[PDB]
RNA sequence: UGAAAUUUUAGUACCUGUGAAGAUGCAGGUUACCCGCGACAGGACGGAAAGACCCCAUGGAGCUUUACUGUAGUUUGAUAU
RNA sequence: GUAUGAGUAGCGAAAGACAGGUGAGAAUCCUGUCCACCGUAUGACUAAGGUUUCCUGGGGAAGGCUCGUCCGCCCAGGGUUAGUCGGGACCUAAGCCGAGGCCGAUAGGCGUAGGCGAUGGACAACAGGUUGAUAUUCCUGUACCAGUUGUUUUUGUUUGAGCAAUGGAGGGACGCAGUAGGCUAAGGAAUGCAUGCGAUUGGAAGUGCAUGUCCAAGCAAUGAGUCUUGAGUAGAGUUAAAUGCUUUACUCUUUAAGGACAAGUUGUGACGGGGAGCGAAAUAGUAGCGAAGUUCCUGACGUCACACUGCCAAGAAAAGCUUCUAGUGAGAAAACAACUGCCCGUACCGUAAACCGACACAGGUAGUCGAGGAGAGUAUCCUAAGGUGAGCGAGCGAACUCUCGUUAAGGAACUCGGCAAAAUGACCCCGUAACUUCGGGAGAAGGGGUGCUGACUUCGGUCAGCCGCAGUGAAUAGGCCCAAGCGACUGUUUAUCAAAAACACAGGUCUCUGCAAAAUCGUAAGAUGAAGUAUAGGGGCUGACGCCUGCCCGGUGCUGGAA
RNA sequence: CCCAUGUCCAGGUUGAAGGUGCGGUAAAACGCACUGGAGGACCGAACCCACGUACGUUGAAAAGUGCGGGGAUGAGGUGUG
């Protein structure tokens, strides 16, 4: 896939904001993207240098509106830790 | 010899076993071992084809050389060993070229004996010769029915056959069963008789010991139901109540011969027994 | 008091799984029957 | 907080008798003010199960054998290879 | 769909009480205090399974057997971070699939090479901290494994360092039982150490009370100890070769020497961390601070380690791994610097209200840890850590039913039957029959002792004294004997009305089977029997052991005979 | 029922064969001690089972519970595939 398609969007939550304080950013990524590809995509997109990348699979969450019940789409969440001496990602 | 256990318990009562005095070591040659799984009398279909088998102790197959076709060098008998697969004891022997092998243990075999194989081998216990080179009246074992196929006849503990005479391309032999028959003169055999002759005197003593030896209980047909066995059914204990006793599949179990009546080997069998 | 059903993911799939159904002709007959009837789930 | 089996409608006594021959309901007589609560289990041939015992059906099924007719296997011969 | 039964049965093992709070509303939600329950568990980990039930904030329609302000429910957001943990990119067992192939009305069955397949083998990281929810995953500190680039120092370039086979090898590599030893956890005691404190109910500033009383992986050194003879000469082998490995004969060595392992200990990791307790405001016991961490006793089947000893029933494979050359070779190695290392799981419940039982069900659910006194013990009673008060209650204290305690005198008169209950029960000592296969019977039977305080002991006792109705003062612990039938025995059986004299059994006997054995599955191929060979395998009957097993072959089977 | 591969059995008791020593003999047989630790061995938790009885019997439970009971190193229990 294309690097620009690897990363979908950032994750803004309390845990993600604490991560940012530690200079790590949480992104939703393509479910087929491995952490090495995620590292490459982040470097190309943001000019930063990546120290490490952690990655999790967020399972689909059951939901229901009225009489219809289904599942939210499965997601892939990546926590990217930038090295020192690296520009911060701005959101 | 046979050692008898004192009747400390009803199970131990009357039990006997072998002292394993002849056994000289308990460490089999790692090279000659092979894995064996317990088939429990079940064929590739998974059905029970032979009853009363399964369970029991694990075993490692020991590659026994029944062919004895290494005539080049002599083999020195290093050890006499117990073999779970067969009644007779085995013998580890080193060939002077460094090939290790297992053979059956003839009665009277001793560590250090230098056995030989081939037409020129002298007539001594443990040596292997083609039948044509064995003088009449000799006691032999580990006979093979096809040249190069390896010994098949006379391999159980204490068994032995005798050479009676020569004729044509065949040799006359009396087998352990008392049956007299012809065997191709090019077939080999080992001089002597299979050792461990005492094996027949062992008293198993308790059911659990049979279970160790992989024998599952045998249920008499007379105590089954009619749909299970021809003898099944009837109120209380009953006699056979048929023309003759029969197997679970109706085959008569007393005196009814089962050998194929057009057996090819009938031309070679001179006098039968059993 | 051990009941008939003892759940096991691996055993369920290996016995009733889609690939097990495909492996044999009659299993494919079952799948065809499920498709003809319109089952949402044709195999375990 | 909150069921169930059962349930033709019931204002649902006793004795003797009568009756498909063992009646809460029919006849004669006797007894009994109306509605309940706590207890018992004689009866409602009480509930539960279209009796398993017994008999019947030109019913079923499992089993047996010197029942009948077949047949897998086994065997013997002819013939082809 | 709605009645009747009926406002009836039931509301599913057990302890709650009060004060305060919240709220429209409180026995049922929150906080507090006391009380009570489990504690070889009702505690702590985990595999499977479930699949969001986890956290935060709201809600009280329905579900919760009452209520509910509350919940494993509903609504809205959020939560699972790995080169090292488990799995895959490693290996194989059973089993399964199966190129060609074999077999077969069709369909297909079987099966070789080759694969898949763990529950097994191999494999590099640990302590602490941190959030409301994750942590050997994040952070801190300090490591290790594989690899890349570079620098430097070494050394080889075709008489060639180095790498190195799918090949030759070694290795991996294994059973059960039994004690004995070492070491460490773990536990206990202490007028050891450190901190805090001095009671009010009569007494105690001391031998008073309470609490705590220690820390990795990795690196370096060392190591209780365990196992093992080691060389040389001549040969023969290891499809090719080998310096590797296997082995035959002959010399020296064999209380040794050499070699291979080894739990653990010491130091460093540690100026770090934890730690009794103290303790901040701005709003908690929270940042933060923080003492001591000794000796002695016991001591592990936890580990050395299947190490040793013994036994018969004789106890996986493969790869990783180490060598050998064959081949391949111009670059390799060491240090240092920097850098790279993918995918799946990671929440939560998990002797349960989250799994299997339709239920928030008295059932079932693999493995690990599982403390203290008395104690052999994980038994039993009461407790620690920790968890919990059971999802209807308040009264009353009738019959009747159930569960439980006691019972005058009698003591099986009950009853089909001593069914049930009662009684015996632990340890120590004395003593113990017929019979017997000489092992047993046997814990036979039947008796005695047991508490506490001194004295002495050879340390097990002894003597002396003291108290009670009673001393294994509670809980936990055989009732026994005589005789008969059946079965020898331990075992097995009708899941869910029968556990037995039934089955099995070791032993006995008969019979079939000469190996492509008989027997069985299959149309066949192909299998099991067997990688077995008549001392073996199949079938029938009998059923330990001891003494025995009589007569009949006319009939029916089987075996033989062949006119 | 079976295959492969794991795993579990607190704590006590008993004392087979073998061995050593001392007696005994001409040598022995044999006897007595010590050592040794066998067993479908003994007692008894967990675990497995399910003998008696009460209760339950629209049950807490479509087979259970309470109190007793048997086995508990084996022909054993049990997990995974
Ligand atoms: K016996
Ligand atoms: K054997
Ligand atoms: K039998
Ligand atoms: K019968
Ligand atoms: K459906
Ligand atoms: K009538
Ligand atoms: K009544
Ligand atoms: K029927
Ligand atoms: K109703
Ligand atoms: K009603
Ligand atoms: K709430
Ligand atoms: K594993
Ligand atoms: K090398
Ligand atoms: K380590
Ligand atoms: K250390
Ligand atoms: K986790
Ligand atoms: K103690
Ligand atoms: K305890
Ligand atoms: K409640
Ligand atoms: K009352
Ligand atoms: K009563
Ligand atoms: K009486
Ligand atoms: K009577
Ligand atoms: K007795
Ligand atoms: K007394
Ligand atoms: K007892
Ligand atoms: K019996
Ligand atoms: K028996
Ligand atoms: K008898
Ligand atoms: K029984
Ligand atoms: K039976
Ligand atoms: K007999
Ligand atoms: K037999
Ligand atoms: K018979
Ligand atoms: K038998
Ligand atoms: K006759
Ligand atoms: K006859
Ligand atoms: K019971
Ligand atoms: Mg991950
Ligand atoms: Mg048999
Ligand atoms: Mg029967
Ligand atoms: Mg029949
Ligand atoms: Mg009969
Ligand atoms: Mg009779
Ligand atoms: Mg009349
Ligand atoms: Mg009348
Ligand atoms: Mg009227
Ligand atoms: Mg009726
Ligand atoms: Mg009828
Ligand atoms: Mg009523
Ligand atoms: Mg309740
Ligand atoms: Mg207990
Ligand atoms: Mg919650
Ligand atoms: Mg909430
Ligand atoms: Mg409610
Ligand atoms: Mg195949
Ligand atoms: Mg958590
Ligand atoms: Mg005072
Ligand atoms: Mg060669
Ligand atoms: Mg130890
Ligand atoms: Mg977790
Ligand atoms: Mg009395
Ligand atoms: Mg009487
Ligand atoms: Mg009477
Ligand atoms: Mg009784
Ligand atoms: Mg007591
Ligand atoms: Mg019996
Ligand atoms: Mg028994
Ligand atoms: Mg039953
Ligand atoms: Mg029963
Ligand atoms: Mg019998
Ligand atoms: Mg026993
Ligand atoms: Mg269990
Ligand atoms: Mg017992």
Residue numbers in the entry:
A (entry chain W): 1 to 91
B (entry chain G): 2 to 275
C (entry chain 6): 1 to 44
Share the article's original sentences:
PoxtA and OptrA are ATP binding cassette (ABC) proteins of the F subtype (ABCF). They confer resistance to oxazolidinone and phenicol antibiotics, such as linezolid and chloramphenicol, which stall translating ribosomes when certain amino acids are present at a defined position in the nascent polypeptide chain. ARE–ABCFs are comprised of two ABC nucleotide-binding domains (NBD1 and NBD2) that are separated by a helical linker termed an ARD (antibiotic-resistance domain), and, depending on the species, ARE–ABCFs may also have an additional “Arm” subdomain inserted within NBD1 as well as a C-terminal extension (CTE). Cryo-EM structures of PoxtA on the ribosome reveal that it binds in the E-site and, despite the short ARD, still induces a distortion of the P-site tRNA, leading to retraction of its CCA-end from the PTC.
Further subsorting of ribosomal particles using a mask focused on the intersubunit space yielded four defined classes, which we refer to as states I–IV. States III and IV were also refined, resulting in final reconstructions with average resolutions of 2.9 Å and 3.1 Å, respectively. In state IV, clear density for the fMet moiety attached to the P-site tRNA is evident, whereas state III appears to be a post-peptide bond formation state with a deacylated P-site tRNA and A-site tRNA bearing a dipeptide. In fact, we note that the conformation of the A-site pocket where the drugs bind is very similar, if not identical, for states I–IV, regardless of whether PoxtA is present (state I–III) or absent (state IV), or whether the A-site is vacant (state I–II, IV) or occupied (state III). Thus, once the drug has been released, the A-site tRNA could accommodate at the PTC and following peptide bond formation and translocation, the context of the nascent chain would be shifted by one amino acid i.e. alanine in the −1 position would now be located at the −2 position and therefore disfavour drug rebinding.
